[PDB]
């Protein structure tokens, strides 16, 4: 089997992407944030504290003839950005782009933190990291990909995120029309539960490539590109007036600037992030200070190839017995 679904930016900055997901019988369609950095499929629901729901579409398990309470199971997750959610668990039928999993754990939120409430466009998350990170207790549950894998034509999914435009998540096949050149594959460590890999270096604008190993995660659920402070300083030094602002929380730059590109290495191959992809707009409405899309990972504990990087590539998440990651230009 295969599936194919369009993923759409939630706003004009590409702060996140939402993908429609069918849950239950009859189908209830929720728009979920596909997150290769986590491993829980959780939704706003009829059980979510009423004051914490503000415009999201909810899953109502009592209206699904295929929903079953997973008795005794609870879940609770905290993301690196400080947001969180928790609740209980149902199993139900879940379909993405025509690919169906029966018996998928659907984690129903009883509580969500303020950032989730405040984002009316995201109805929940669909985790695509390794199932070892799943938070369900006392019986850990499998991700949608992990459940679908054996049925797929090939044990892979691909992320093709758009810049200020829709893109595609495919399951079970590689669309050879969706990229240019060849796909370069690189090794993955699953030891921390992430799609963790080592970039071979970087360049700023038209500058020379610096060969250096950068260990990080391919994370569709993180907006920005977080890299070591040395790399980030070298980038922003090429933008007149750019500076790190403790009060804003990262590098800012004059909105009048033209940003240079940023290149990262995948083996001997190179992925070029255009300068425009690094502009996250005014820090507050009407400001002439703009927020940068490349930020320091110091204090995070890991480097993060988030959407800013991934949207410049066609990315293969290869879930073969030994997982790997593939990157192509597009």
Query: Catalytic annotation on 199?
Result: yes
* 311: Cα within 13 Å, side-chain hemisphere: 29
Which one of the listed residues 33, 35, 119, 307 is annotated catalytic? 35
Q: Are 220 and 17 in contact (CB under 8 A)?
A: yes
Per-position DSSP letters for 57-93, written without gaps between them: --B-GGG-TT-EEEEEEEEEEE-TTS-EEEEEEEEEE
In three-state secondary structure terms, 313 is coil
- Using CA atoms, how far apart are residues 323 and 156, in angstroms rounded to an integer? 9
**Number of neighbours of residue 287 by Cβ within 10 angstroms:** 13
Helix (H) or strand (E) holding 217: strand 210-218
Which tokens in the block code for residue 279?
């502009």
| Candidate list 199, 261, 296, 297, residue with the active-site label | 199
Tokens describing residue 117: 């409430």
Q: Which residues, other chains included, contact 5 with Cβ-Cβ below 8 Å and sequence gap of 6+?
A: 19, 20, 21, 96, 97, 168, 169
d(CA 74, CA 136): 6
Q: Which residues are catalytic?
A: 35, 199
């Amino acid at each position: 089997s295969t599936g194919s679904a369009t993923t759409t930016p939630i706003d004009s900055l590409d702060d996140a992407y939402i993908t429609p997901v069918q849950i239950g019988t009859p189908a209830q369609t929720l728009n979920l944030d596909f997150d290769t950095g986590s491993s829980d499929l959780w939704v706003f629901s009829s059980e979510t504290t009423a004051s914490e729901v503000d415009g999201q579409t909810i899953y109502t398990p009592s209206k699904s003839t295929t929903a079953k309470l997973l008795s005794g199971a609870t879940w609770s997750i905290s993301y690196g950005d400080g947001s969180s959610s928790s609740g209980d668990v149902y199993t139900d039928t879940v379909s993405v782009g025509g690919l169906t999993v029966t018996g998928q754990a659907v984690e129903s939120a009883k509580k969500v933190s303020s950032s989730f409430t405040e984002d009316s466009t995201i109805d929940g998350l669909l985790g695509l990291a390794f199932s070892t990170l799943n938070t369900v207790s006392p019986t850990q549950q499998k991700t949608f990909f992990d459940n679908a894998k054996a049925s797929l034509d090939s044990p892979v999914f691909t992320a093709d995120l758009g810049y200020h435009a829709p893109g595609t998540y495919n399951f079970g096949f590689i669309d050879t029309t969706a990229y240019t050149g060849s796909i370069t594959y690189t090794a993955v460590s699953t030891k921390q539960g992430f799609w963790e890999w080592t970039s071979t270096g970087y360049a700023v604008g038209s500058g020379t490539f610096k060969s250096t190993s950068i260990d990080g995660i391919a994370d569709t659920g993180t907006t920005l590109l977080y890299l070591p402070a040395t790399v980030v300083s070298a980038y922003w030094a090429q933008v007149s007036g750019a500076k790190s602002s403790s009060s804003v929380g990262g590098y800012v730059f004059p909105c009048s600037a033209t940003l240079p590109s940023f290149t990262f290495g995948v083996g001997s191959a190179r992925i070029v992030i255009p300068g425009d992809y690094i502009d996250f707009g005014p820090i507050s409405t009407g400001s002439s200070s703009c927020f940068g899309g490349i930020q320091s990972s110091a204090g995070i504990g890991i480097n993060i190839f988030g959407d800013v990087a991934l949207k410049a590539a066609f990315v293969v998440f290869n879930g073969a017995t030994t997982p790997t990651l593939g990157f192509a230009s597009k």
